[PDB]
Design a protein around this ligand. Structure first.
Ligand SMILES: NC(=O)c1[nH]cc(-c2ccncc2)c1Cl
Lengths: 366, 263
């Protein structure tokens, strides 16, 4: 079967831009994940000296994650959302490669660096101007995404990149559209068509109680989780992996950690909790009295965040259990926390020395 | 997906009519302009039938149709066989529109059964491609559309308009059906979808003898562009009357340029 005109085919093949002809990346892998691999790459022509990131998408062909990342990043344009420069399609192995400007840093590595300090009795918390500037730019990017009907659905420190030395020094880039949806995306009665998830530290409580809707409020919760982790260096709802994975929404231990931090919601705090699909499972497995002495105040107080601070008051509005009582991105940006000294800056490193090590190359066999 | 004026659809895929006609000249050595339009309608009907068999919602079928029209707006009918391209467009659109990835057996069964049951006057032999061909054509389709996947349609703005009129129950079903019918033309390549919607609403108001001149007068839109679209719609119903696809399509298909084989 020859479905393509011969002359068309030879011309296409002659002119096709090939990733391995244009970029040098062999032995330059810097990340791996369910998404695929990321390489730090240089142009093989001498035409510029920039570092680029190449994302080799997991698997063969156009998976659902590949499709939505290409579709959405193709449309989107904002200083706090990673910009897709090019898509390379490699026809022989049916591999997809995405080209981006290289971001030396991200929040996973930044937080790790500070947590390592504290654990080394050589303690350094994240500077408070940097924390605020990061949060502001996260909120700015997600507000733009939301305004354009895109829900991210996988916000977490590894997905919040920060640009290093160069023309965009200290700028936040939200990355990885692999889980993203539009407001109006159909609800699939069975499993969400997403990559596998094994930890749920950033997942809003309504999801853990089986709510099926895609919402802006779900992203806002995750950003609250990130703000807390930036203030304290610890993932606030850290929880072990379950021994037995299942794909159903209810995760007992994750909920238990949440109630240990936040307390168990009273009827008046979250009236529609009774409407959650897993509400009777919650009543079966939990007793609200187990958590009577728990609250975000007490948790944050232990981690040297003062509960009368503007930072704490903002955090509490992001980490509100009832999604309908959760602050929006635009209201969060209007919060007086952002008017209090120091103002957020467009370079989150505020012109100062960056202490964070550069990414190292991954040389292991997979 | 929230802002048409910043979209790839608007910035790359609203084409000039003259450039479009200029590109098509390569294929018009074999086909009259009339026959080229008939062939476009035919393939629109093929894609609609594939979507129905697979039980896909109208937005998926509409997106698939736009990919098909965009592809042959730039490239020759002989570049890739449209018999493969039509199901490939459905396959990709299903992913983009979040239905999911159609299984190997369901896709090939749909293409096979649809051509056999509903289009046997044009296709004497069974669908001749396998899933590997679809996957190969998908990669080509993706790159050749410059990776533009999000498509805006007239259905959303149509609904908003009828609601603004307060005439949803009365006008929507006809206006909606007219929107479906516009996929028989080039309009999706030529005009913003809200303008297509207004034109469709207008024709529906004409058909139902509903006076809404006031409401249309209160819109700040280029009424001259709307009138152009209305003329295309009225004209497509005259062509419909005069076209018998079942009697004509076998001959038209045999005149279509075929891909040159490898030497
Ligand atoms: N999962 C992702 O999509 C991802 N994660 C990190 C990157 C990256 C981008 C640009 N520079 C360095 C790293 C990307 Cl892309």
């Amino acid at each position: 079967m020859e479905f393509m005109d011969y002359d068309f085919k030879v011309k296409l093949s002659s002119e096709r831009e090939r990733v391995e002809d244009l970029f040098e990346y062999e032995g330059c892998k810097v990340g791996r994940g369910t998404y695929g691999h990321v390489y730090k790459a240089k142009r093989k022509d001498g035409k510029d000296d920039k570092d680029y990131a190449l994302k080799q998408i997991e698997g063969t062909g156009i998976s659902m994650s590949a499709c939505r990342e290409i579709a959405l990043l193709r449309e989107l344009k904002h200083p706090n959302v990673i910009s897709l420069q090019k898509v390379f399609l490699s026809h022989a192995d049916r591999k997809v490669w995405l080209l981006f400007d290289y971001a030396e840093h991200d929040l996973w590595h930044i937080i790790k660096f500070h947590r390592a300090s504290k654990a080394n009795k050589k303690p350094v918390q994240l500077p408070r101007g940097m924390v605020k500037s990061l949060l502001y730019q996260i909120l700015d990017g997600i507000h733009y995404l939301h305004a354009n009907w895109v829900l991210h659905r996988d916000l977490k420190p590894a997905n919040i990149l920060v640009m290093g030395e160069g023309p965009e020094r200290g700028r936040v880039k939200i990355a990885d559209m692999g889980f993203a949806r539009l407001f109006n995306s159909p609800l699939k009665p069975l499993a969400d068509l997403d990559p596998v998830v094994v930890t749920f530290w950033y997942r809003a409580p309504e999801l853990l109680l089986g709510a099926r809707h895609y919402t802006k409020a779900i992203d806002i919760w995750a950003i609250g989780c990130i703000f807390a982790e930036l203030l304290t260096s610890e993932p606030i709802f850290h929880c072990r992996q379950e021994d037995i994975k299942t794909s159903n929404p209810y995760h007992h231990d994750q909920l238990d950690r949440i109630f240990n931090v936040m307390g168990f919601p009273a009827d008046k705090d979250w009236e529609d909790i009774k409407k959650m699909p897993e509400h009777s499972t919650l009543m079966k497995d939990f007793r609200r009295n187990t958590y009577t002495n728990c609250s975000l105040i007490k948790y944050m107080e232990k981690h040297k965040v003062k509960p009368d601070s503007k930072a704490f008051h903002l955090l509490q509005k992001l980490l509100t259990m009832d999604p309908i009582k959760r602050i929006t991105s635009e209201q969060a940006m209007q919060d007086p926390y952002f008017l209090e000294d120091p103002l957020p800056t467009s370079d989150v490193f505020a012109g100062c020395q960056i202490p964070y090590p550069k990414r190292e190359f991954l040389t292991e066999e997979e | 997906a929230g802002n048409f004026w910043q979209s790839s659809h608007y910035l790359q895929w609203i084409l000039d009519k003259q450039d479009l006609l200029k590109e098509r000249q390569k294929d018009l050595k074999f086909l009259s302009e009339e026959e080229y339009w008939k062939l476009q309608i035919f393939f629109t009907n093929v894609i609609q039938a594939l979507g129905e068999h697979l039980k896909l919602r109208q937005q998926v079928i509409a997106t698939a149709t736009v990919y098909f029209k965009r592809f042959y707006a730039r490239y020759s009918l002989k570049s890739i066989d449209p018999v493969l391209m039509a199901p490939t467009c459905v396959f990709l659109a299903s992913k983009v529109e979040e239905f999911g990835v159609v299984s190997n057996t369901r896709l090939i069964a749909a293409a096979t059964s649809v051509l056999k049951t509903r289009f046997s006057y044009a296709f004497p032999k069974e669908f001749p491609y396998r899933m590997n061909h679809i996957l190969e054509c998908e990669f080509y389709l993706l790159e050749l559309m410059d990776c533009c996947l999000i498509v805006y349609h007239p259905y959303r703005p149509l609904l908003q308009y009828v609601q603004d009129m307060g005439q949803e129950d009365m006008l929507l079903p006809l206006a909606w059906r007219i929107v479906n019918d516009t996929y028989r033309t080039d309009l999706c390549l030529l005009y913003p979808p809200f303008m297509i919607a207004l034109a469709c609403l207008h024709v529906a108001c004409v058909v139902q003898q509903k006076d809404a001149r006031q409401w249309f007068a209160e819109l700040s839109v280029d009424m001259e562009k709307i009138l152009e679209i209305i003329r295309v719609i009225l004209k497509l119903y005259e062509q419909w009357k005069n076209f018998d696809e079942r009697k004509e399509m076998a001959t038209i298909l045999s005149k279509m340029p075929k891909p040159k084989p490898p030497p």
